[PDB]
Amino acid sequence: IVGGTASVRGEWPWQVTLHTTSPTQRHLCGGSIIGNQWILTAAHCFYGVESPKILRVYSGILNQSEIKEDTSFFGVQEIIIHDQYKMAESGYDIALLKLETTVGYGDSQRPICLPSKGDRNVIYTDCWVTGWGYRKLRDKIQNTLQKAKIPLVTNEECQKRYRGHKITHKMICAGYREGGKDACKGDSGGPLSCKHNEVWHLVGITSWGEGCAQRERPGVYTNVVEYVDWILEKTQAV
Numbered sequence: 001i002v003g004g005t006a007s008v009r010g011e012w013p014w015q016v017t018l019h020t021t022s023p024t025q026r027h028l029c030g031g032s033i034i035g036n037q038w039i040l041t042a043a044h045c046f047y048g049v050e051s052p053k054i055l056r057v058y059s060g061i062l063n064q065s066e067i068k069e070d071t072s073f074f075g076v077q078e079i080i081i082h083d084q085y086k087m088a089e090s091g092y093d094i095a096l097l098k099l100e101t102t103v104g105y106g107d108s109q110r111p112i113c114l115p116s117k118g119d120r121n122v123i124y125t126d127c128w129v130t131g132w133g134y135r136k137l138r139d140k141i142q143n144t145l146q147k148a149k150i151p152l153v154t155n156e157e158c159q160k161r162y163r164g165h166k167i168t169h170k171m172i173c174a175g176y177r178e179g180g181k182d183a184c185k186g187d188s189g190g191p192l193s194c195k196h197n198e199v200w201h202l203v204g205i206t207s208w209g210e211g212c213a214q215r216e217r218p219g220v221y222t223n224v225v226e227y228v229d230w231i232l233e234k235t236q237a238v
């Protein structure tokens with residue numbers, strides 16, 4: 001997160017830190033709890049990941065120092081990547097991780113509400129990008145979960161800012177025309193949470209951008225309202 005501040009413990013209880021074991025343990029991506037055995041993250045997070053066996057989900061974490069050999073986690077039973085996903089810059093940069101065990105909801109961890117089918121009509125003023133990502137393009141993973149308020153940008157305006165790209169309606173952009181606040185290396189997969197009618201909704205998944213918080217370069221997210229059916233099809237399998 002560029003131009004953010006430290007979170008208060010329990011602010012984003014749906015927020016998780018997805019770690020890899022191969023070769024060494026280290027943070028891989030962000031993610032969101034959407035069900036008692038479901039985490040929604042970015043499909044690009046599993047580039048090169050050959051087995052769910054090397055993954056660990058840590059919920060109820062404010063600081064990365066909280067993760068030690070004795071820290072409890074969730075094992076990944078299954079990695080479900082959107083089967084139309086080729087690359088972040090094309091879209092379908094969404095994946096589900098089915099956990100081996102049940103997340104027990106409490107004061108440190110709970111799910112985030114997905115956008116409703118009728119929520120496509122609403123305008124979001126209160127949106128926030130969260131992660132343990134870099135504060136700048138050449139940095140390191142942050143210990144304390146940063147938070148940043150970013151305005152949502154139109155498809156038309158985002159398309160103007162990304163000449164040479166193809167900004168689909170399956171994509172959602174957020175940025176200040178002058179930059180300063182955005183997501184960065186280490187934040188992907190993580191949420192773009194919007195508070196509407198005093199309820200937080202998972203409006204986006206941190207995906208890609210050209211550099212970090214550059215003027216006239218909004219960060220691009222997976223427009224989650226366009227994937228509610230896929231998420232339900234994959235989480236609600238008979």
Ligand SMILES: COC(=O)Nc1ccc(-c2[nH]c([C@H](CC(=O)N3CCOCC3)NC(=O)/C=C/c3cc(Cl)ccc3-n3cnnn3)nc2Cl)cc1
Pocket residue numbers: 026027028029044045047088133137140141182183184185186187188189206207208209210211212213218219220221
């Ligand atoms: C000790 O542990 C560690 O050090 N762990 C560690 C873990 C992961 C990373 C890391 N993560 C990423 C991914 C892309 C990726 O993982 N890949 C690999 C797979 O193919 C796609 C790229 N991008 C993002 O997360 C966000 C992009 C972004 C998003 C928005 Cl909204 C706006 C601007 C954005 N940025 C434009 N440039 N930087 N950020 N790159 C790096 Cl490098 C670095 C370190």
